[PDB]
Design an enzyme around this catalytic site. Structure first.
Site, PDB file in Angstrom:
ATOM      1  N   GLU A 198       4.230  -3.768  16.141  1.00 22.61           N
ATOM      2  CA  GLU A 198       3.380  -2.595  16.030  1.00 22.61           C
ATOM      3  C   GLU A 198       4.264  -1.361  16.067  1.00 22.61           C
ATOM      4  O   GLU A 198       5.261  -1.330  16.790  1.00 22.61           O
ATOM      5  CB  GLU A 198       2.380  -2.517  17.194  1.00 22.61           C
ATOM      6  CG  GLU A 198       0.965  -2.951  16.894  1.00 22.61           C
ATOM      7  CD  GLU A 198       0.085  -2.912  18.134  1.00 22.61           C
ATOM      8  OE1 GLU A 198       0.145  -1.913  18.882  1.00 22.61           O
ATOM      9  OE2 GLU A 198      -0.670  -3.880  18.363  1.00 22.61           O
ATOM     10  N   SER A 202      -2.756  -5.357   9.841  1.00 23.98           N
ATOM     11  CA  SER A 202      -3.512  -4.162   9.466  1.00 23.98           C
ATOM     12  C   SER A 202      -4.827  -4.525   8.785  1.00 23.98           C
ATOM     13  O   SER A 202      -5.866  -3.916   9.067  1.00 23.98           O
ATOM     14  CB  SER A 202      -2.674  -3.266   8.564  1.00 23.98           C
ATOM     15  OG  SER A 202      -1.944  -2.319   9.319  1.00 23.98           O
ATOM     16  N   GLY A 210     -12.526  10.377   5.768  1.00 25.33           N
ATOM     17  CA  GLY A 210     -11.845  11.144   6.795  1.00 25.33           C
ATOM     18  C   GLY A 210     -10.342  11.106   6.605  1.00 25.33           C
ATOM     19  O   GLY A 210      -9.681  12.149   6.558  1.00 25.33           O
ATOM     20  N   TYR A 267      -8.007  -4.834  10.599  1.00 21.96           N
ATOM     21  CA  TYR A 267      -8.679  -3.623  11.055  1.00 21.96           C
ATOM     22  C   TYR A 267      -9.515  -2.963   9.966  1.00 21.96           C
ATOM     23  O   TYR A 267     -10.132  -1.928  10.220  1.00 21.96           O
ATOM     24  CB  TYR A 267      -7.652  -2.638  11.623  1.00 21.96           C
ATOM     25  CG  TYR A 267      -7.131  -3.080  12.972  1.00 21.96           C
ATOM     26  CD1 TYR A 267      -7.969  -3.118  14.079  1.00 21.96           C
ATOM     27  CD2 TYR A 267      -5.811  -3.487  13.135  1.00 21.96           C
ATOM     28  CE1 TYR A 267      -7.507  -3.532  15.317  1.00 21.96           C
ATOM     29  CE2 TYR A 267      -5.338  -3.901  14.369  1.00 21.96           C
ATOM     30  CZ  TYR A 267      -6.189  -3.923  15.457  1.00 21.96           C
ATOM     31  OH  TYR A 267      -5.721  -4.338  16.685  1.00 21.96           O
TER      32      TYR A 267
HETATM   33  C1  LIG Z   1      -6.903  -0.726  17.692  1.00 24.36           C
HETATM   34  C2  LIG Z   1      -5.934   0.328  17.176  1.00 24.36           C
HETATM   35  C3  LIG Z   1      -5.270   1.095  18.303  1.00 24.36           C
HETATM   36  C4  LIG Z   1      -5.642   2.561  18.089  1.00 24.36           C
HETATM   37  C5  LIG Z   1      -6.645   2.672  16.941  1.00 24.36           C
HETATM   38  N1  LIG Z   1      -6.581   1.344  16.355  1.00 24.36           N
HETATM   39  C6  LIG Z   1      -7.124   1.072  15.019  1.00 24.36           C
HETATM   40  C7  LIG Z   1      -6.052   0.454  14.141  1.00 24.36           C
HETATM   41  N2  LIG Z   1      -6.158   0.542  12.818  1.00 24.36           N
HETATM   42  N3  LIG Z   1      -5.352   0.082  11.863  1.00 24.36           N
HETATM   43  C8  LIG Z   1      -4.201  -0.602  11.869  1.00 24.36           C
HETATM   44  O1  LIG Z   1      -3.707  -0.872  10.787  1.00 24.36           O
HETATM   45  C9  LIG Z   1      -3.447  -1.075  13.084  1.00 24.36           C
HETATM   46  C10 LIG Z   1      -2.257  -1.780  12.915  1.00 24.36           C
HETATM   47  C11 LIG Z   1      -1.538  -2.229  14.024  1.00 24.36           C
HETATM   48  F1  LIG Z   1      -0.388  -2.910  13.849  1.00 24.36           F
HETATM   49  C12 LIG Z   1      -2.000  -1.982  15.316  1.00 24.36           C
HETATM   50  C13 LIG Z   1      -3.185  -1.283  15.501  1.00 24.36           C
HETATM   51  N4  LIG Z   1      -3.841  -0.914  16.637  1.00 24.36           N
HETATM   52  C14 LIG Z   1      -4.931  -0.252  16.243  1.00 24.36           C
HETATM   53  C15 LIG Z   1      -4.972  -0.206  14.895  1.00 24.36           C
HETATM   54  C16 LIG Z   1      -3.887  -0.839  14.370  1.00 24.36           C
END
Ligand SMILES: C[C@]12CCCN1CC1=NNC(=O)c3cc(F)cc4[nH]c2c1c34
Length: 350
Positions: free
Chosen positions: A327, A243, A210, A246
């Site tokens: 973030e 990151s 995607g 996730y």
């Molecule tokens: C849970 C959340 C919020 C909206 C969709 N999400 C997926 C996500 N994915 N990937 C990342 O690398 C990431 C890195 C961050 F510093 C904060 C993050 N908050 C999210 C992510 C995220």
């Protein structure tokens, strides 16, 4: 038979594996007999998103929790789950809603990937690897391991792994330079905004079909804006491990993919706690959630005129914050230009 470089071929095989999508679904305890991969719908996912937003609005202004229970049972009827003999989680609070919203993000991405795999044209003379590579409409090149790009990327991974994230350490297997068809034209309006930074975005392997096809996207309108800490935007980190968390890697599947993106942040709206918004205040281009730990600004460098915060972790000097690490959130898909894709081996500390 294919001529692609063999790292790119492994990447394609990794991105388009149906079994990995089924494993992701089983990991969310979804019922694969009552609702298999082929009966995953975009509109069904959007209806589930709307149920989550109804739970959000109900909880927010003193509705029956009778109401909220009915909406939770409706959610579990719309997306059938397999919990065995445990009681399914209830959608009565903010954390339940947020868990289900992240789950639906990944479900929507899986639907996009399966829709890609079974769509378009199929050509019996051609290697399926070549077919899927051109389904990505992306230019994927292997980065030379001895280049300076690779130097900086390895140093970025090496220097910004947090101590809190002590379950694993990361090894870079391959570094890919990617270019999304059309993305550079879309990014052009933001390429001389001030404060552009190279940042991480992790996600499940199944999702990159995607992400490479349509870019990183914002949640649909039916998604509850309170299901995400800083609202409905695109989220990046400057710590590689934040990151990488996730990727949703596991001991049984320890290879993950992570993105490096040029993000035009501009004026950052600095926040220490959750703020469920869809738009920024006039004159701001991004949100920065401030952590107690930041990459050392001393040590930032530049790569193609973009700042890289590959410094080691030090204290921000921010005191009443609720985030351990930074973030970055943008609210316009055009403000992102994906530059690199990384294959990472997760060595789990056991
Ligand atoms: C849970 C959340 C919020 C909206 C969709 N999400 C997926 C996500 N994915 N990937 C990342 O690398 C990431 C890195 C961050 F510093 C904060 C993050 N908050 C999210 C992510 C995220």
């Amino acid at each position: 038979k294919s001529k692609l470089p063999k790292p790119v071929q492994d990447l394609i095989k990794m991105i388009f594996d149906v079994e990995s999508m089924k494993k992701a679904m089983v990991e969310y305890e979804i019922d694969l007999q009552k609702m298999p991969l082929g009966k995953l719908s975009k509109r069904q996912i959007q209806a589930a998103y709307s149920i989550l937003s109804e739970v959000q609005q109900a909880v927010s202004q003193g509705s029956s929790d009778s109401q909220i229970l009915d909406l939770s049972n409706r959610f579990y009827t719309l997306i059938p789950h397999d919990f065995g003999m445990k009681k399914p989680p209830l959608l009565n609070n903010a954390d339940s809603v947020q868990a289900k919203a992240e789950m639906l993000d990944n479900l929507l991405d899986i639907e996009v990937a399966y829709s890609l795999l079974r769509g378009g044209s199929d050509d019996s003379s051609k290697d399926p690897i070549d077919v899927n590579y051109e389904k990505l409409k992306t230019d994927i090149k292997v980065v030379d391991r001895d280049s300076e790009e690779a130097e900086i990327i390895r140093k970025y991974v090496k220097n910004t792994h947090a101590t809190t994230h002590n379950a694993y350490d990361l090894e870079v297997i391959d570094i890919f330079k990617i270019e999304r068809e059309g993305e550079c034209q879309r990014y052009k309006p933001f390429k001389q905004l001030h404060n552009r930074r190279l940042l991480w975005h992790g996600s499940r392997t199944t999702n990159f079909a995607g992400i490479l096809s349509q870019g990183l996207r914002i949640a649909p309108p039916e998604a509850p804006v309170t299901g995400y800490m800083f609202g409905k935007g695109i989220y990046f980190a400057d710590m590689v491990s934040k990151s990488a968390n996730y990727c949703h890697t596991s001991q049984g599947d320890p290879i993950g993919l992570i993105l490096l993106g040029e993000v035009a942040l501009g004026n950052m709206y600095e926040l220490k706690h959750a703020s469920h918004i869809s738009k920024l205040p006039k004159g701001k281009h991004s949100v920065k959630g401030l952590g107690k730990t930041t990459p050392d600004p001393s040590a930032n460098i530049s790569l193609d005129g973009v700042d890289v915060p590959l410094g080691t972790g030090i204290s921000s000097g921010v005191n009443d914050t609720s985030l351990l690490y930074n973030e970055y959130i943008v609210y316009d898909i055009a403000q992102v230009n994906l530059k690199y894709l990384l294959k990472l081996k997760f060595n789990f500390k056991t």
